[PDB]
Design a protein around this ligand. Structure first.
Ligand code: HAS
Ligand code: HEM
Ligand SMILES: CCCCCCCCCO[C@@H]1O[C@H](CO)[C@@H](O)[C@H](O)[C@H]1O
Ligand code: CUA
Ligand SMILES: [Cu+]
Lengths: 557, 33, 166
């Protein structure tokens, strides 16, 4: 059933743009629920308008559950399986198992479908974190469960066409994109353990019928095992594009490939053993395990601190190369007309307050000041809804023509670039209002608009959330209209469909071999990665699994 | 060609931002203690 | 230019790591300074403490709310608090200023938040376990209690009161 020879010699080009369109679909219907949530956090009850316009929506909380799952869980994993298979693919000029990269999409698809149905019909409105005792349909804890395991297919695929390539190429260090990709996918295996343990061992027995209750401490001390590295799971495909494709959209070179390895290496070692940072306010977990976990989280920040110097060093060198001038001429020198450039560069800027917020959340006792306030969705919109979501958006404008001929028009370029700026400016304004609101104590996950008189001190950041709501609709509407317009043209020109993935040269230095070589002992680093997990999680997960105090699940909705 | 002075200005902005979030939320914390 | 903007860019790389570890270590020394002062008192007790959620109103220290405030020290009162679908018990919670209040909360239904506006008391409340936080109010007044953890459609309305007696 294939054809136009571009899609012939590379049919994973097809296996990519399917993932990359289910992932966008999910992002569309999720982000609809979004401006409705902003108006709320700006004391404006726009839910009459929603229940008329989507009479299937029951509660404020139904949509947040959709907002959560479709955006953070679903949009991101698929964009991750797109970029992080198809990249070690196009680099290596090899073909991923064409059969297995289809046990993925189907697998994910019906797994998505089997979760979509009970959510769509009020049966698992337990928010994107399903913390027991809240319980939902068997089909939810089945669907999202099948959906995540889809990734295990990805780990094999990629490890596989790595270990293939290795054999044909003895003595030759692993390629940059593939190296990225291999530590990435390994780290995620070691991390999916939790959300699968909790799914098999508790969520599925409990929800099918075979136990009457789950222990909340462990369901949650397990959920966060995964819950944390999964955001570094959503991050690194974007760090992929930024270290290896963005310096050339800029007119430059990735200045140090050893560093752009050391970062990924470091995410392999330290993304998983951290979850207590989400449990600072839980009982029945020791202050010293929280503390070892605090300090470790402050370390999962070093590779991003470094990511900052390397990416700036790089954009700046590109900028000087086009005649950029004094201390700041280089910003003005860059291609501020290519949304594939503008998109992830605006996201990187919003990332400076996001990471700062992160470094507070991590700081053990300081999480008491802002835990479960609006400060937290303030922090993570700057991280996943702005940086991560934006890179992707802007990577429809170089990754899309490179997957189905259809080129990008100067009508489309100028709508890709207005979309991107409004969604960035929207996000910043929501950052202020949400951070400021949390500091004034406004809770998170709350229909506060129904209690319009309870947070008088939040008067002025509430005006900010309203502005940010309007603006993200004007950007969500132009982006929907936009996303169809590109991949609903006839147009299919197959030439820029074989213009090879626009990677970057890589200012090679003498220091490269001792360093690179060291980090290429993948198998060994993977052994350190799963010993840190055993040192951090074991003494607790085991003085726990031998103290289980399970409890009836409740449906309050 | 020299001092990547510009990249230095960006990690300086990052640094100042990390500092004022941290030190800001650090006082708020004692204020409520 | 080009391979000498590699000589410079990887040594700055070296300087910036130095600086950043130095900075993250101050944050560890300062977090650690908080980790022993009265302000540290709000950290949930480490020890496990299991109870039966469905029997919890029908027997034990959280069963008749007038008994919630029980002195357990010369300058120390323990407040058994129970947090449930869409309210708190007792309400208000009366405690005197200057006193160590050991709060011991739990839930007969779903997980709840217990966040005392104006204070660092911010703690999760799990059905089947007892969170034990620990605080000393230095100003008399009323303090609102907010549930900051989603527990079904009652959530935005779930609030309590603590009066701290002049
Ligand atoms: C995609 C997503 C996310 C990233 C990335 C992320 C990063 C961090 N987070 Fe987080 N987070 C926490 C700590 C951190 C820390 C220490 C980091 C670090 O990894 C961040 C490091 C980042 C930096 C150090 C920034 C460097 C800046 C760069 C690299 C850009 C530079 C600009 C350049 C380069 C160019 C400029 C261009 C020119 C033209 C000049 C903690 C606690 O320690 C909590 C629990 C708090 C609570 O009470 O719930 C938490 C809660 C969340 C939740 C809530 C989960 C829930 O629903 O309960 C989400 C969704 C989330 C997402 C994400 N988070 N986080
Ligand atoms: C127009 C765009 C968006 C707007 C206006 C928006 C707004 C909001 C607001 C105000 C909340 C807080 C609601 C509450 O705590 O009651 C929220 C939650 C959330 N958003 Fe967004 N968002 C948008 C896009 C995104 C995107 C793209 C992602 C993608 C990765 C995302 C991930 C999340 C997550 C995980 C939550 C947490 C919900 C929960 O706590 O269960 N959001 N959004
Ligand atoms: C991007 C961030 C925007 C920040 C805007 C300024 C908010 C100032 C925070 O006020 C704090 O609020 C609480 C009042 O209830 C107290 O607990 C605390 O003592 C008080 O000082
Ligand atoms: Cu109890 Cu929200
Ligand atoms: Cu985390």
């Amino acid at each position: 059933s294939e054809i136009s020879r571009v899609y012939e010699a590379y049919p994973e080009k097809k296996a990519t743009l399917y993932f990359l369109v289910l992932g966008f679909l999910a992002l569309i219907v999720g982000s609809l629920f979004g401006p409705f949530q902003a108006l709320n956090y700006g004391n404006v009850d726009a839910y009459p308008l929603l229940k008329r316009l989507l009479p299937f929506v029951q509660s404020y909380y139904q949509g947040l559950t959709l907002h959560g799952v479709l955006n953070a869980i679903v949009f991101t994993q698929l964009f991750a399986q797109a970029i992080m298979v198809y990249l070690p693919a196009r680099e290596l000029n090899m073909r991923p198992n064409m059969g297995l990269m289809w046990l993925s999409w189907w697998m994910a698809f019906i797994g998505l479908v089997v979760a979509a149905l009970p959510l769509l019909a009020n049966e698992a409105t337990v928010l994107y974190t399903f913390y027991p005792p809240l319980k939902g349909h068997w089909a939810f804890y089945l669907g999202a469960s099948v959906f995540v395991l889809s990734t295990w297919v990805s780990i094999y695929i990629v490890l596989d066409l790595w270990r293939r390539w290795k054999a044909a190429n003895p003595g030759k260090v692993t390629p940059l994109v593939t190296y990225m990709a291999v530590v990435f996918w390994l780290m995620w295996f070691l991390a999916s353990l939790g959300l699968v343990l909790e799914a098999v061992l508790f969520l599925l027995p409990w929800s099918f019928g075979l136990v009457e209750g789950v222990d909340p401490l462990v369901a949650r001390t397990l959920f966060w095992w995964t819950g944390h590295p999964i955001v570094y799971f959503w991050l690194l495909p974007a760090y992929a594009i930024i270290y290896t494709i963005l310096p050339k959209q800029a007119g430059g070179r990735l200045v140090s490939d050893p560093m752009a390895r050391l970062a990924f290496l470091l995410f392999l070692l330290l993304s998983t053993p951290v979850g207590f940072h989400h449990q600072f306010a839980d009982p029945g977990i020791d202050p010293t395990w929280k503390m070892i976990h605090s300090v470790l989280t402050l370390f999962v920040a070093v590779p991003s601190l470094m990511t900052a110097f390397t990416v700036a060093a790089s954009l700046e060198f590109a900028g000087r190369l086009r005649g950029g001038r004094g201390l700041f001429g280089w910003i003005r020198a860059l291609p501020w007309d290519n949304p594939a450039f503008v998109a992830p560069v605006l996201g990187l800027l919003g990332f400076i307050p996001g990471g700062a917020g992160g470094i507070v959340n991590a700081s053990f006792t300081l999480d008491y000041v802002v835990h479960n306030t609006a400060w937290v969705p303030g922090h993570f919109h700057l991280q996943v809804a702005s940086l991560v979501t934006l890179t992707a958006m802007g990577s429809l404008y170089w990754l899309l023509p490179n997957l189905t001929g259809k080129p990008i028009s100067d009508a489309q370029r100028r709508l890709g670039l207005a979309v991107v700026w409004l969604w960035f400016l929207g996000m910043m304004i929501m950052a202020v209002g949400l951070h400021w609101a949390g500091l004034l104590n406004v809770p998170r996950r709350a229909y506060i608009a129904q209690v319009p008189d309870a947070y008088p001190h939040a008067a002025v950041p509430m005006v900010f959330n309203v502005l940010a709501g309007i603006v993200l609709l004007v950007a969500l509407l132009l982006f929907i209209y936009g996303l169809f317009s590109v991949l609903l043209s006839r147009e299919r020109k197959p030439e820029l469909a074989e213009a090879p993935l626009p990677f970057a040269e890589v200012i090679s230095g003498p220091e490269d071999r001792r360093l690179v070589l060291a980090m290429d002992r993948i198998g060994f680093w993977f052994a350190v990665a799963a010993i840190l997990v055993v040192l951090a999680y074991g003494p607790t997960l085991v003085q726990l699994f031998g103290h289980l105090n399970p409890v009836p699940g409740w449906r309050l909705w | 060609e020299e001092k990547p002075k510009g990249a230095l200005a960006v990690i300086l902005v990052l640094t100042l931002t990390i500092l004022v979030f941290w030190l800001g939320v650090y006082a708020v914390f004692f204020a409520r203690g | 230019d080009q391979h000498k903007a590699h000589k410079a860019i990887l040594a700055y790389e070296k300087g910036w790591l130095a600086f950043s570890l130095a900075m993250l270590f101050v944050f560890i020394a300062l977090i650690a300074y908080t980790l022993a002062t009265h302000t540290a008192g709000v950290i949930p007790a480490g020890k496990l403490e299991r109870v039966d959620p469905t029997t919890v109103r029908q027997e034990g220290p959280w069963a008749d709310p007038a008994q919630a405030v029980v002195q357990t020290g010369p300058n120390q009162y323990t407040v058994y608090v129970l947090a449930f679908a869409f309210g708190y018990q007792p309400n208000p919670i009366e405690v005197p200023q200057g006193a160590e209040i050991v709060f011991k909360i739990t839930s007969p239904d779903v997980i709840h938040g217990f966040h005392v506006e104006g204070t660092n008391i911010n703690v999760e409340v799990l059905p089947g376990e007892v969170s034990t936080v620990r605080y000393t109010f230095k100003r008399p007044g009323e303090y609102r209690i907010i549930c900051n953890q989603y527990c079904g459609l009652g959530h935005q309305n779930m609030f309590g009161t603590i009066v701290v007696k002049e």
